[PDB]
Structures are given as structure tokens and as C-alpha cells.
Design an enzyme around this catalytic site. Structure first.
Site, short mmCIF file in Angstrom:
data_model
loop_
_atom_site.label_atom_id
_atom_site.label_comp_id
_atom_site.label_asym_id
_atom_site.label_seq_id
_atom_site.Cartn_x
_atom_site.Cartn_y
_atom_site.Cartn_z
N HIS A 1 0.80 -1.28 -0.05
CA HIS A 1 0.08 0.10 0.06
C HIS A 1 0.98 1.35 -0.02
O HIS A 1 0.25 2.35 -0.05
CB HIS A 1 -1.31 0.03 1.22
CG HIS A 1 -1.80 -1.11 1.17
ND1 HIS A 1 -1.32 -2.40 2.00
CD2 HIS A 1 -3.15 -1.35 0.62
CE1 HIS A 1 -2.85 -3.17 1.64
NE2 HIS A 1 -3.52 -2.65 0.80
N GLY B 1 -4.45 11.36 10.27
CA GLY B 1 -5.35 10.46 9.69
C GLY B 1 -5.62 11.01 8.15
O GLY B 1 -5.93 9.94 7.01
N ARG C 1 -3.91 16.54 5.09
CA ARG C 1 -3.15 17.18 6.39
C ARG C 1 -1.80 16.73 6.31
O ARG C 1 -0.77 17.36 6.70
CB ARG C 1 -3.89 16.65 7.79
CG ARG C 1 -5.03 17.36 8.22
CD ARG C 1 -4.75 18.58 8.75
NE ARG C 1 -6.06 19.53 8.91
CZ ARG C 1 -6.75 19.72 9.86
NH1 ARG C 1 -6.43 19.25 11.06
NH2 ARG C 1 -7.88 20.61 9.50
N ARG D 1 -3.55 4.81 -3.75
CA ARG D 1 -4.68 5.00 -2.99
C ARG D 1 -5.13 6.52 -2.60
O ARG D 1 -5.91 6.76 -1.78
CB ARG D 1 -5.00 3.96 -1.89
CG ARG D 1 -5.20 2.64 -2.38
CD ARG D 1 -5.25 1.65 -1.19
NE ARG D 1 -5.60 0.26 -1.76
CZ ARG D 1 -6.77 -0.16 -1.74
NH1 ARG D 1 -7.83 0.59 -1.58
NH2 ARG D 1 -7.00 -1.48 -2.46
N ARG E 1 1.02 9.64 16.16
CA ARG E 1 -0.02 10.23 15.66
C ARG E 1 -0.17 11.56 16.12
O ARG E 1 -0.10 11.69 17.15
CB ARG E 1 -1.21 9.01 15.92
CG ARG E 1 -2.53 9.85 16.01
CD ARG E 1 -3.66 8.79 15.80
NE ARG E 1 -5.04 9.51 16.16
CZ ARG E 1 -5.75 10.04 15.26
NH1 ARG E 1 -5.32 10.23 14.06
NH2 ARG E 1 -6.81 10.47 15.62
N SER F 1 -7.12 14.16 15.86
CA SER F 1 -8.14 14.83 16.61
C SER F 1 -9.06 13.75 17.35
O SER F 1 -8.72 12.46 17.00
CB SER F 1 -9.29 15.82 15.83
OG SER F 1 -8.33 16.81 15.48
N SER G 1 -11.30 18.08 18.42
CA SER G 1 -12.30 18.50 17.14
C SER G 1 -13.53 19.10 17.48
O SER G 1 -14.30 19.96 16.82
CB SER G 1 -12.32 17.22 16.00
OG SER G 1 -13.23 16.48 16.54
N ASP G 2 -14.04 18.72 18.38
CA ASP G 2 -15.58 19.09 18.94
C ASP G 2 -15.63 18.37 20.24
O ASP G 2 -14.94 17.42 20.92
CB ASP G 2 -16.57 18.75 17.85
CG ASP G 2 -16.62 17.27 17.91
OD1 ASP G 2 -17.68 16.47 18.38
OD2 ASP G 2 -15.83 16.48 17.16
N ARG H 1 -8.50 26.01 16.35
CA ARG H 1 -8.12 24.90 15.18
C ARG H 1 -6.77 25.23 14.92
O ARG H 1 -5.77 24.50 14.84
CB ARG H 1 -9.06 25.23 14.04
CG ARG H 1 -10.25 24.46 14.51
CD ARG H 1 -11.23 24.33 13.23
NE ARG H 1 -11.27 25.62 12.55
CZ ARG H 1 -12.45 26.39 12.98
NH1 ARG H 1 -13.25 26.10 13.90
NH2 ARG H 1 -12.86 27.60 11.94
#
Ligand SMILES: [Cl-]
Ligand SMILES: [Cl-]
Ligand SMILES: [Cl-]
Ligand SMILES: [Cl-]
Ligand SMILES: [Cl-]
Ligand SMILES: [Cl-]
Lengths: 231, 231, 231, 231, 231, 231
Positions: free
Chosen positions: F3, F19, F23, F42, F86, F89, F201-202, F215
Site C-alpha cells: 500500500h 489520519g 493534512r 490510493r 499520531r 483529533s 475536534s469538538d 483550530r
């Protein structure tokens, strides 16, 4: 949709669902007319166009149950999608299954916990929509594409030290992929129609393997079947 | 064969599998020529006769995964049976299933542990043989038999204080019965062909009960379809 | 009772429960006076008669947890049965256990999911009614029948590729059968009294095996104990 | 023996197993002659003396499956102990159990994972030794000690937010304690003889508490019965 | 507190938690001033005194999740304890971990069912209080005590025939102990701060082993770190 | 590497793992010199450049355990990557977590089955590398970045009808994300170093949403800290 940057109305009632957003782009540009791109969020391309007068969308899903679950939930709940056809790849786990074979999945086993989370002691067996599956089977005959109809295994771990593919193959399972259990379960729960059409991209027993490029742009037979089956 | 008192040769390569051994007797005497009873052990009658020249057996299985597993294992392993077709009833769990409907099971969910015993963390989804299923579907359509293709739930507990049928029905499951997971799993593990054809004995959700004409018509249509499922 | 074609009142407060309806018939005709057959549904015979002035019923249960659960639920809930004594067979899994030995089961392990369905994380250990078990033990002394008292394993799969009988035997388990967990659990849940009396029909380690006929008509010692213990 | 600081020979072949090492001290000093303390490791006292000429040991186990498992494994494996009798308390969970009752446990349910670790999909039902249980029962009846024979629940969590005691009691379970599953499983795995005799410390359901006379009488009767359980 | 014979107020806001009540006694008498013993119930000693002007309690917990859960629940719920520092021992399961090494546990794996009882399908990962852990790490630097920071395994079975220590070590787990999962889970659930400081008492791979006495009275470095970290 | 379409040498020994592959592009172009794109398979972009002279890679992982597992396995096994961080968020689940907070995950809970597949009855608790975590913490404190250290929950279902977030939050879990269990487990199994740094994120509980400044500030501080976590 947190993960789809589209307005209601921009996605068709019928959506093809490759795991690879670059395959979504290839499919849309190669098979559809008057293509619009309605989503670029996270690079997970989604497109809408026409195939012989019928509106068709093509949405990348990413790999694995959690990724496809995000996209399928949003397509159903926010965009009112009715027919969802995965056009994916799988690894053959049986000698009689060959690279580039097209498989129509009746059902899928899994080592995802997604259904045990919902049902505990119950083994939930996801089920293809028979109408979509029959339409695909008839489309394959029309287009001269041999198909194999049976079951697949939806894996969480592509690299799995505890793989039970040998026992799964003995139980008749054709191939390993990463999405079908989620698609079938979510579509049924929401009263929508789903089907997984898969091309064998590699053979787990022999080691035969198509390239990344081949996976992205050369699995034409499954798209022919998919598109002919809905139009 | 501990539970089947037959000589080698006395069982055909195709067997119909009602749960009730008295229904086995009725099927054999009503539909087959030159009937012989090859088993009386435990009163679980099995018969062999001919349908349009072809040898066909009819073996009662009893109720539940453990009972049918005994009979199916012995049929497969001791008698080299090739095609195994359950002909039975289920309780309908979805509002859109009518008591006059005949169901061809693509797959089955279960609360039996038989597949967790084999697979642990894997949810195994049993799968009908598509050749038998498609032959049945075509046979049903040719005789104007209302047929629904989908999944059923194989229950261990006919009387279940912890029943999840409401959630199963929401997930699209058509009905509840007590054998299909075992038939499908065992046939696939041994490379044999299986299908379950089910009539609706009653509606679990609506409480609707069958009439005489429904019972007669659905039973006859079920047997007719079954006898046209192979080849 | 969906599965028992009897009217309330036709079944006694005390019921013997062989798995084989033909053994039920043998027991009733051989040991009871003024026998009436109250059930022929599915060929699963049930009889009522008298033993030395006490009313006794004998009801076939079929094989496996799901089958016995159907019959036991109906006997308790529809017919108000109070004392339920299984008179069954089992396969010996220990060298010191011999063919034709009579076993009184204190409890049973299982690979049925029936109790995990109810309790999840809890291992529920079913328990014989001590009064019935003591009465049986005293009856065996009176009749000169040696008995072994201990635990058994209630199997869902008579033919089990994943059998743990070797480990179960090391943990002291005497034999494998297919019904006891269901009987003991259901009786206790409903405040009724249950006991399983078993005759060893075969030896899993040595391969020694009684015939179908021997199982049907020659396990007289367990019936002697059962009947003497309730009268 | 990591946790028991005894020389070979210092522990008898029969051991009483209270949870509280101070109760071990009390039992030994009150009931046995020529008492020696063979273990002070972790303050988990173990003593050996004679009862009517016969060597008997009394070893505190601590609370819960893991603690008793340490002591029982070491007693069995390092000291060749043959008969192991837990003498402890439980919280009653059934209305029909009175705080003045003495319970002989035939078996125990649990939320411990110890047996799933060993057996996976199998529910293992631990079983008392019937010889010890029957000797205890007879001894209890000979001294007019109110005795109930049935099952208990071995809890991991004395304070459990997810307690299933209401359902356990409905299924006939008498009381809750913290050790019996481990004692019974370990003794059986090693071919040794075990029994648990339990007094009621309090009523979990009714909230009833014991009086001085009840505590004294039940404790004395428990020890008396225990000392008459072997041979 | 059913298991702690103290009055509210007798236990400090900060409590050290060895498994061995005799180590609790050694710690209290060796490191604290004006020591009072507030608990002797079950011989599970608990003490309160001062370390450089700060009030500190030291409470034996016993061995295993169920034992420590009893004591920790009582300390939190009845005595309003705020900071709980286990000072325990563990068996090394990795070559690079040596006897007498001091370990600060970030988290712990387990084969206790305690969290599956609460969460079912969820794997709950317990978590040390970072403030306590940082304070310990800084205290170790101040006192010249090397520390290893990582994860441990909380075992239910000290003698486990089905041990997965080899796989756990490959996944980075340092050592096996019997309490941490319970401490960390219970403290977090109740909004209190917990940390486990462990001394390696033995090496599971090499067989090197400290004596009972050494465990009771010679693990001074972990106490130095613990006490310096809170004062 | 199925991959990842990179040549040996093109990926650095330290990789940041957002992720979203867009980004990844943004991080690489904003923070690194002499950037090369080594993977377009991909559309899951991976880049390598230098930060203060040191080679650093940034590889998009996609969403969920199965997707990140693919990328991490290939990075570790095919590219000998040593440090994996990693940068992503989470949705906050505790009232005391503010949307302006940066979280360093010590461990993660999950509903993924990946560790039950490996360990069965064992709950495996994944663990951050303490060296990377402590370096991050110090770096955060040196730049006055509000940081919380604790655990997160790795969800398989972003849309979960059976969510246990209320109970998870009560047990102290800070937030929900979709990758950390896999990163931490895989890195530890292969002896590599991992950490997850998460912005909010929230707020899932309060419904609070981020502002532009939050942010920007949290993202920049996250990357800054990450680039100071190694060595
Ligand atoms: Cl796999
Ligand atoms: Cl059900
Ligand atoms: Cl078995
Ligand atoms: Cl409980
Ligand atoms: Cl272990
Ligand atoms: Cl969730």
C-alpha cells in the site's frame, strides 16, 4: 456529513463504492458522462455523472470496516442513498479462485466486533440484496463476464498473525477483503439495498499479485457488470 | 452411523430434510415412487424413493442445531450425500413477510455457539449454495410461487426470555427457525451443496395464523420447488 | 403446547425424560400400568400410566439443548409438571467409567450458549435437585444398582472437530451427553425439581459401543432407580 | 511453596479453608490438639493439630478466586493435600434462605474468568466431591443442623455495579461468596476431594442480620460437620 | 466498611497499598512517626502515621483483583481516600527486566473479567494518574533510584496452565502482578488518583527468586520513591 | 509494501501519522524542507523532508484500526521505522476537557476486536512509549501548551447505536478517536516507539465547537510538540 463535503442532492440514489478514491476517479472519468466532483474532504473523492442516461455516483470508502462505515452511514442518513454497490478487490484463499475472477458476495464472515457490539451472543450474518445480486448475475451473462457467487471474509487485520484463512477456506469462503460486512449490515439496518462485487487482486496461497496501478485502473469487468446491472 | 440404521446404498445423493419425521413419511409417500424406510432409530424416520426416475431421500432431522447436526454429519460423512435441502417452517418476524410466503434462505444468523466453538473471535456467516438457490428461485418463479430471498435466524431457544427478534427484524432478518445455520455450515465444511426452503408457520410479530389453504399451498409449493433445485 | 398435543391434566406431576421417543414407549409399556398415549405430535411420544399406584408420565425429548428445551418448557409452563427425571445415555470420557454404568449428574458443563445468552459474563452452573438426587441414590442402594455421582458435559456437537473432552475428563467430568444443562437450568428457573440419571452407552476412549436397539430397550437399571426413587 | 513457609510433613492431608487467617487460628486453637503454626508468610496463618487423633490443618485463604487459588494450588501441588474443605460465609440471595441456615455447595456459578481462560466457549460447572458432600449431609442431619444443599455464586466483585444476583436467585442460586469456584475447579483438576460449607453472614435481599446465637451456633455446627466430612 | 474496622477520620487522604499486611506493618514502623493501627480485621493491617509532617496511611490489600477491590472500594467510598499508591511486587517476564528493578506502571493488561463485566465488547485500558506517576518519576531521580516506566499484566492465576506471558512480553509487557487493573479502574471510576510502584521480586524466565522475608522487609527503594513523591 | 509505493530509503526512521492525507501534505509543506512525495497509492499521501536537518516522514493513515494497521505495519516491517507519532483529533467526552486542550494518550480503550483476536480472554492495554510521552510533555510545558495526559477510546463506529461513551467518561476516558489502540499495540509488538497527540475536534458531550484560533493554535502546537518528542 462530517466527512462528505457535498450538499444534499449532489449524490445519486445509486452509488458505486470502491475502497480507493483514485479508483473512484478512474471509474467516474472512464465510464460516466458529465462528471462533477462533489467531495474532496480527506482526499476521499466522490463523483456524480450519468451512465446511459441514469445518474450514478462513485464514492471512495477507504479501507476497513470503520472507514466504510463512516461513508456508508453518511450516504444513507444525510444523502438518502438507496442502492450501494461496492466494487472492490479481494485476496483469494482457495485454489479454485483465480486472480482477476469477479465474485458476487452473498454474505461475509468477519473478525470485526461491530455486530457483537450490537448483538452480543448472536452471530449476525449480513446478507446481500437479492435483487441487486440477481441483476448483477444477469448483467454478467449479458456482458460475457464469468462470475463466482459465494461468501467472503471481512478482515480487520490485513497483516494478521492469528489469521484463520485456512479454516475459513475449508468452510467454503472464497476470499478476504475489508469492507463487506459493514456495507451489508448498515444497508439492511436502514432498509437500503447493497451488493459487493469484487475482483480477485491477489492470491493468498500462491503469492500472485497485481500491482497498485493494476488495482487502480484495470479491473474493468467488475465495473461493466456493476453499471450494466443498474441500467 | 450411530443414529441412522441404513445399509450403504440405501440413501440417495440428494436428501430433503424436514424437521418432523412424520412429515418425512408424508413427503416420501405423497411424492416418491417405490418408497423404502431405511431408518427407524429413535423414530427419526428416513425414506428413499424416486422422483421422475431419480433417487431422492427424505430424512427427519428433529429440532435445533444439535439434532440436525447429528443427521447431517451422518448423511454427509457415512452416506456421501451431495445435496441437502431443508424443507421446513419458520416464524415470520418482519411486517412485510406474509404467512403465505415461501423463503429461500441466503444465510442465517444464530445464537448457537457452534461457530464460535470453531472460530472464536470470528463471526462465521453460513452461505447457501448459489446453484441450488438460483435453481429454486427459477423453479418458484416458473410456478408462480411467491418467494422471498433473504436471511433467517437459527434459534437455540424457541422460548427465549432474551430474544433479540425485534432488532433482528430491523436488521432485515425474515423469520426464526431452528436448523439452517447447522445445515449450511456443515454442508460447506464438507464441500456439499445445501439450501433451506421455509414456509411461514405463523407470524411472530403480528400474531397472524395460517389457514388450511395457505398450509396446503405453501407446503406443496415448497416440496415442488425443492424437487426442482438440483441440476 | 405447540409441540405437545395433550389437554391439560393428561400429563402427571412426575415425568421421565428419555431423548428417544421409542425408549419412552418401551419404558411406558414395560414398567407402567393402564398406559395412555397423550402425544404423537412430530412422533415425539408421551405416555401416562401408573407405577405401584403413582401416576407417572414418560415424554421423549429429542436430542440436544434446543429440543429438550422445547419439551421441558411446555411440560412446566402448560402442564404444571413438578418433577422431571431425565433417563438418558452418555459417552464415557474417563477410563474408570464403564459402559452400562449408571451416573447421577450433580451438574453439567456445556458448550451451549443458552446460559451466556441469559447471563453474559457469568458462568451459570446448573444444579440437580438434591432431594431427587438423594432419593435416586437411596433407590439405587435398595435395588442393588451401583451408581456414580458427579458431573457431565452437555454437548451441542456430537461430532465436534474442536472437542475439549480430554481437558474436561482431566477436570473430573465423567461423560458427554446432550440435554442436562437445559433440563437443570429450566427446572430451577421455574422452581421445579430435576435430575438426570444416565446410562453409559459407549466409551469415547475405547470405542466400545452399544447398539441402537440396546439403547432403546436394555437400559433397565436406570429405569428401576428412577421409578423406585419416586414411589 | 512461594506463599506457604512450611516444611514437607507439616501440613496434613486434610485441610479446612476459612477465608480469614484469624478464624484459622481460632478453629485450630478451639478444636485441635497439639497445634503448631506452620505458616506466617503474609500473615496468612496456617496451623496443624489433631482432631480425635487425626492430623488436620487449617489454612487461611484470603478473599477471592485469585487468593484462594494460590493457597489451594500450593497445598495440592507442594503438600499433596487430599481433602480440602472451605468453611466460610456467604450473603444469602433467596427469600427462602434464612440467616440460621448452613449451605453445602453442590456447585458454583461465577463471574471469574478463570474457567473461560481454560475452556473458552465451554461453561465449566465445578462440582463438589459427592463422597464429602454426602458425609457432610449425614453428619448435619445427625446433629440436627438445618442444612440446604444447592449452588452458590462465586463473585469477583463484592461491590458490583453490574450485579446479577436478582437473576441468579431466580435461577435457584442460594448465596454469594468469593472462593468456591476456584476450590472446586482446582481440586477436580488435580484429582483431590473438595467441599464448601457456608454459613450465612447476612441476607443480601432482605437485609436481615445475624444475632450472636446464630453466629455462634452456625459457626460451631459448620466446623463440627466439616470435621465429620472425610471417611 | 465491612472489612476495615476503623472510624471515619482514622485513615489519611494518601494511602500506600502493599498486598502483604506484614509489609504494611514493616513500612509503617520503619518509615512513619506516631503510628496508630486502625485495622486488624482479617489480620489485614492498616496503619496511620506521619512522614515529614504529612499524614500517610498504609493498608494491606491481600492478593488478587477481588481482594484489592474490597479494600480500595472501602477506602474510597467510606474513608474518602484521595491518593492511592500500590507498593507491590511483580514477576519479570522480559530478559531486560531484572530482580529488584522498580517499575512505575502506566497501565495494566489483565485476564480478570472485571472490566468485561462492566463494558462487554469494550477492552477498557486502565490508566495511572499522570500527576502521581510524574511525581514518582521525579522522586526517583531525587533519590537516585532507577525506574522503568511501562505496562504490567494483572493476573488472576498465579499458577496458570494457560499463561500468555510469552505473547505479553513480546507486546512489551514488563511483569506479572495481581492487583493493578483493579486499583487503576476503581480509582478512575471514583475520580481519585492512583499509581502502582512495583519491585521485581522474581524472574519468570530465569527462575531467580527473592525469599518471603526479602519481599516483606527489603524493598526499600520503592517505599523511598513512594514517600518522597507525596511529600 | 502493498500500500506504500516507496523505494527503500525514502521513508525516515521517524514518522508523523495524521489520519487525513491532505493534512499530511500540509504538515510536510509547512514544516519540512526539501519535501518529496514517496507515495500516491490510493491517494494516501506520504512525504519526507527535513526538520532542523533531521529526516522526518509524514504519512496519512486513513480512519480506523484496519486502515492505520495497514500503514503502520508496512512502515514498521518494510521501512524499519523506529518512532511513530499520531497527530490527529478526538471528540472530547468529559466535561473537564476543553476544545482548546491537547491530549497525550497514555493508553487507549477500544471496541475493536484486534486484541481479543490475539489474546482471547486477556484484555490487552496498549501503552505509549514513556520516553516519547515525557519528551512531549516537557516540550508542551516549555511552550505553554495546555496539555492533558490520560486515556482515549479507539472506536470502530463513529456512528454507534450502542455507544458506551457516558460510562467511558465516568471511568476517566478523555475523548474518542479511531486509531490509537492499533498504533500503540503494533509499535509495541515490534519494539518500536509510539505516541498519539490529539487535538479536540469538538465536544461530544457539551456540543461545543472549535473556533478558527483554537483550530490553528491547537494544530500548530500539536505539530510543534510532535517534532520535539524524539531524543
Ligand atoms: Cl485474517
Ligand atoms: Cl430467539
Ligand atoms: Cl464435544
Ligand atoms: Cl455480584
Ligand atoms: Cl498468567
Ligand atoms: Cl463509540
Amino acid at each position: 456529513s462530517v466527512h462528505i463535503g457535498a450538499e444534499k442532492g449532489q449524490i445519486a440514489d445509486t452509488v458505486l463504492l470502491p475502497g480507493d478514491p483514485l479508483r473512484a476517479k478512474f471509474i467516474a472519468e472512464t465510464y460516466l458522462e458529465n462528471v462533477e466532483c462533489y467531495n474532496e474532504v480527506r482526499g476521499m473523492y466522490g463523483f456524480t455523472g450519468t451512465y446511459k442516461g441514469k445518474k450514478i455516483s462513485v464514492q471512495g470508502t477507504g479501507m476497513g470496516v470503520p472507514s466504510i462505515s463512516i461513508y456508508v452511514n453518511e450516504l444513507i442518513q444525510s444523502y438518502d442513498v438507496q442502492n450501494l454497490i461496492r466494487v472492490g478487490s479481494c485476496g483469494a484463499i482457495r485454489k479454485d479462485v483465480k486472480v482477476r475472477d469477479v465474485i458476487l458476495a452473498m454474505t461475509s464472515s468477519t473478525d470485526s466486533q461491530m455486530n457483537r457490539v450490537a448483538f452480543g451472543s448472536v452471530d449476525f450474518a449480513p446478507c446481500a440484496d437479492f435483487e441487486l445480486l440477481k441483476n448483477a448475475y444477469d448483467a454478467a451473462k449479458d456482458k460475457g463476464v464469468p462470475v463466482t457467487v459465494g461468501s467472503v471474509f471481512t478482515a480487520d487485520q490485513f497483516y494478521n498473525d492469528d489469521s484463520q484463512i485456512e479454516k475459513l477456506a475449508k468452510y467454503g469462503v472464497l476470499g478476504v477483503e475489508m469492507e463487506t460486512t459493514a456495507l451489508y449490515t448498515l444497508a439492511a439496518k436502514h432498509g437500503r439495498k447493497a451488493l459487493s462485487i469484487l475482483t480477485v487482486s491477489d492470491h493468498v496461497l500462491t503469492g500472485e499479485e497485481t500491482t497498485a496501478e493494476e488495482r487502480q485502473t484495470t479491473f474493468h469487468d467488475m465495473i461493466d457488470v456493476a453499471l450494466h446491472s443498474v441500467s
